[PDB]
C-alpha cells in the first residue's frame, strides 16, 4: 500500500509537470508560476509522506 | 595516449560555442568507464586480462591506455552522461530515462572518503550521524603502525 | 627563469677612478639533487634514515648542488668564463616514499 | 568570473585574476563593471548603465573605450568588431551605446595613454612618463597570461572584447551567472606549487644576499669567492621554519 | 484592515490595493520609442492617422510651435485592467508632473493598442534667456530621451513609493479575524479581507 | 539547487523536474537509498549542522 | 520595427541623428568627421520593457549533438516530419516563469526549431 501510494504520488507529480509544460497551470495570486508549481509539488510530496 | 595525456580537461560549450582546454595543476578528476552505443567499452577479455595482472603485468595504466577509462574532471561533468550501472544501459527505449550515455560509474560507494567508508551500510543511517562517525573515526583506538 | 646577476664596480669614493670598470655576470643553469645525507660534527657524511631522523630529531633533507657560470668582462678585453660546479646551496626536505 | 551585487553602485561585475604562468610578479585582479541604474542624476538618466574598468595599480575608474583606444584602435567599428561578434543583435548594440557616448574627448592613442597615466599611482609630468607608465600597466599588469612581450595588444584586445562580450551576455541572462561555491571554478594547491612558491621567495632572498655580498666586495676593486658568496642557511632555514 | 464594504467585497479591496501598491510606468506599459514627426497631421504612423487629426482639428496650442520630436508609448491592456486605471488619470498625472511643457495625445478606449504621443512645445519666450554657459547645452531628442527615462523610472501613477509588493488574503485562524459580540452574548469571528 | 547546468547531478537529464532529480526519497532507510537520493540526504543533513 | 546605427565611411565612428530645417529631413551625420546620409527609417531609440524574444533563433542548432539534453519521439517535426526531437527550456530571464518547452529537430539537414 505504501509503495502504491508513492507510485501514485509520483504519477500525480508527473501529471503536474506535464500540465505545467502544456500551459495549463493557472498561477495563484500572491506568487508567481514558479512558486505556485513548487508549492503544488511540495504539498503533494508532503501529503504523500 | 598519443599526444594529449588523460590529465588534460576539455569542455565543449555547445550552447555558447566554446572549447576550453585546461592543463594546469589543481584540477581533480575521477576515472570513469566509456560508453558508446548503449554499451560499455569494458569486456570480459579485459576481465581476464585483469585476472592475470595478479600473475604478471596487466596494470591499471594499461587499462587507461586501452581507451576504456578516462579521467573526467568536475568541469567536464556538465557535458557528459554517467550512469549507475549497465542495468540502466539495457533498458528498453519505450521507458528509457536516457538513450545517449557517454560514461558509467565503476561503483558509487567510492564517493565516500576514508573515515566515512568504514560505516557498515551507510545508506541506512543518518548523514549527520555519518559525519559524527567520520569525526570520531579518527579518535578510535588500535594498532596505528607496525 | 631567474634573471642573471649583472654587476658593475662603482669606486666613486676614491681618486683615480677607471672610466671602464670591470664587470661580472653570474648564471645558474643546472640542478643536482643527491640522496639525503647527514653531516656529523666532524664533517663525515652518512646516509640518514627516516628512523634516524625521527630518533635524533633531525630533518630528513637532501643537499642541492648548482652549477655557476661566472663571466668576467673588461671593456676592451676578452671576457673569461669560470665554472663553479656542484656548488652546495642548501638542504631541501624530502617527503617519504 | 561574472558576479552580481545586491548592494553598491555596480549592477554586475566581471573579475579575472590573471597571472603569468610559473613566474614571479604575482596575480593581478582586473575588473570590468557596469554602473547601477539607480543614480540620482538628470543627465545620467538617459545614459543609464555604463561600462567601466578597474586596472591593476590604479585607484580610479576608467571606461573600457579609452582602454580600447589605448591599444591602438581609434575607430569605433574596429572595437565593436572586437567586442560584438555578430552585428545583427539589436539590444547588445543598444547596450554598448553609453560608454561610447561618454568617451568622445579621447579619440587618439596617446591621449588615451595620458588618460590612463593621469589616474594611476605616482602620476608623472609632461605626459611622456605617463604614456610610458600606461604602456607598462597595459603590457605588464593587464592580462599577463595572454602575453607580456611586445606586439601582444591584438590578443589582449581580443580577450578584452570577449570578456566585455561575456559581461553583456550575462546582463541579459543569455548565459548563466558564475557561482562562487561551484567547485569546478576551484583549484587545489598541494605541496608542489606551495613549495615552489617558497622556493621562489627563498631564491629571491638568496639572490639578494649574494648581490649584497658581491656589491660590498666589488666597490673595493677586489674579487670574491663564490663559495663564500652563497649563504646556504637561508633556504634550509626558511623551509624548516615554514614546515 | 478594512472597514465597510471593502472588508467584505473583493472589488473594493482590490481598489484599495490599487491605491496602496506602487504602480510606476514599469508595471503598466509594453514599450517605448522615440520618433521624428515633421508633419503632425501627416505622421509616419498610419494607425495614429485615424485619430491624431481628431486631436489637431481643435488644438489647444499652435501646431507650428511644437517640436518635431515625438515620444510614442505603447501600453499593456492587461496591466491597465489589473491596475483599474483610466486614461484621463494618466494624462492628468503627466500634465501635473511636467506642467505645460508637454502635450499628451492618447488613444481611444476600444483600440487594438494604447498609443501615446508626447510632444514638447518650443517655448520661444525662454529661448532668449541669458546666463547659460558650461551648463551642458542639450539637444531636443536627447532631452526627450532624458525626460523619457524620468517618466519611465521615477514618477508614480498611484500608490506609495515606500511600499513594494502587496498581497490580498483572508485569514484562516482567529487572530486576524474581527471578533465581535453577537446579540446572544457569544464571540463571533468574521474573516474579513485584508492587506499585507 | 541546480549545481550543474540545469542539473542537480550529471546522472540526470537537463530540465528535469521529476522527484528523482528533485530530491524526493521514495525509499525508506530500511530498504536502502539510491546514491542520488543518499547525496540529497547529505544535502539535507549538512544544513542542520 | 527596430533600427540600429550606421558607421562612417571615412573614419568608422557613429553617425548621430541631426535635424536641419532647410529641407525638413533628418540627416544621420558624423561628429568627428564630415560624412552624412539620409534617413531610411524614422526611429532613433526604441526601448522595450516587455520585449518579445524570438529565442528560437537564439538557441544554437548544434545542441542536437548534446547527450545531456532530453529526447522525445512523439512530437513530429513541422518541416521534415522527423519523429525524434530534442526538447528543452530556454535560458533567458523571462522564460522561467512560463514552463515552456522548446523543440529542436534532430535531423542535421533540417534543424527546425519550434514551440508546442
Ligand atoms: Zn566620419
Ligand atoms: Zn525536421
UniProtKB/Swiss-Prot annotation, chain C:
Belongs to the RNA polymerase beta chain family. Component of the RNA polymerase II (Pol II) complex consisting of 12 subunits. The gene is Polr2B. It is found in: Nucleus. The binding of ribonucleoside triphosphate to the RNA polymerase II transcribing complex probably involves a two-step mechanism. The initial binding seems to occur at the entry (E) site and involves a magnesium ion coordinated by three conserved aspartate residues of the two largest RNA Pol II subunits. The chain holds residues 62 to 158 of 1176 of the full protein. It comes from Drosophila melanogaster (Fruit fly). DNA-dependent RNA polymerase catalyzes the transcription of DNA into RNA using the four ribonucleoside triphosphates as substrates. Second largest component of RNA polymerase II which synthesizes mRNA precursors and many functional non-coding RNAs. Proposed to contribute to the polymerase catalytic activity and forms the polymerase active center together with the largest subunit. Pol II is the central component of the basal RNA polymerase II transcription machinery. It is composed of mobile elements that move relative to each other. Transmembrane segments: none annotated. It comes from the Eukaryota. This is DNA-directed RNA polymerase II subunit RPB2.
UniProtKB/Swiss-Prot annotation, chain E:
The tandem 7 residues repeats in the C-terminal domain (CTD) can be highly phosphorylated. The phosphorylation activates Pol II. Phosphorylation occurs mainly at residues 'Ser-2' and 'Ser-5' of the heptapeptide repeat. The phosphorylation state is believed to result from the balanced action of site-specific CTD kinases and phosphatase, and a 'CTD code' that specifies the position of Pol II within the transcription cycle has been proposed. There is a cross-link at residue 127 (Glycyl lysine isopeptide (Lys-Gly) (interchain with G-Cter in ubiquitin)). It is found in: Nucleus. It comes from the Eukaryota. The binding of ribonucleoside triphosphate to the RNA polymerase II transcribing complex probably involves a two-step mechanism. The initial binding seems to occur at the entry (E) site and involves a magnesium ion temporarily coordinated by three conserved aspartate residues of the two largest RNA Pol II subunits. The ribonucleoside triphosphate is transferred by a rotation to the nucleotide addition (A) site for pairing with the template DNA. The catalytic A site involves three conserved aspartate residues of the RNA Pol II largest subunit which permanently coordinate a second magnesium ion. Belongs to the RNA polymerase beta' chain family. DNA-dependent RNA polymerase catalyzes the transcription of DNA into RNA using the four ribonucleoside triphosphates as substrates. Largest and catalytic component of RNA polymerase II which synthesizes mRNA precursors and many functional non-coding RNAs. Forms the polymerase active center together with the second largest subunit. Pol II is the central component of the basal RNA polymerase II transcription machinery. It is composed of mobile elements that move relative to each other. This is DNA-directed RNA polymerase II subunit RPB1. The chain holds residues 1134 to 1329 of 1887 of the full protein.
Curated annotation (Swiss-Prot), chain G:
Its main location: nucleus. InterPro entries: DNA-dir_RNA_pol-M_15_CS, Rpa12/Rpb9/Rpc10/TFS, Zn_ribbon_RPB9, Zn_ribbon_RPB9_C, Znf_TFIIS. One of its GO terms (cellular component) is nucleolus. It is found in: Nucleus, Nucleolus. A zinc finger (TFIIS-type) spans 73-115. GO terms for biological process: maintenance of transcriptional fidelity during transcription elongation by RNA polymerase II; mitotic cell cycle; transcription by RNA polymerase II; transcription initiation at RNA polymerase II promoter; transcription-coupled nucleotide-excision repair. The keyword Nucleus applies. Pfam families: Zn_ribbon_RPB9, Zn_ribbon_TFIIS. Keywords: DNA-directed RNA polymerase, Metal-binding, Nucleus, Transcription, Zinc, Zinc-finger. Disulfide bonds: none annotated. A zinc finger (C4-type) spans 8-33. Zn(2+) 1 binds at residues 8, 11, 30, 33. One of its GO terms (molecular function) is DNA-directed RNA polymerase activity. Gene3D superfamilies: 2.20.25.10. Zn(2+) 2 binds at residues 77, 80, 105, 110. Belongs to the archaeal RpoM/eukaryotic RPA12/RPB9/RPC11 RNA polymerase family. Component of the RNA polymerase II (Pol II) complex consisting of 12 subunits. DNA-dependent RNA polymerase catalyzes the transcription of DNA into RNA using the four ribonucleoside triphosphates as substrates. Component of RNA polymerase II which synthesizes mRNA precursors and many functional non-coding RNAs. Pol II is the central component of the basal RNA polymerase II transcription machinery. It is composed of mobile elements that move relative to each other. RPB9 is part of the upper jaw surrounding the central large cleft and thought to grab the incoming DNA template. This is DNA-directed RNA polymerase II subunit RPB9.
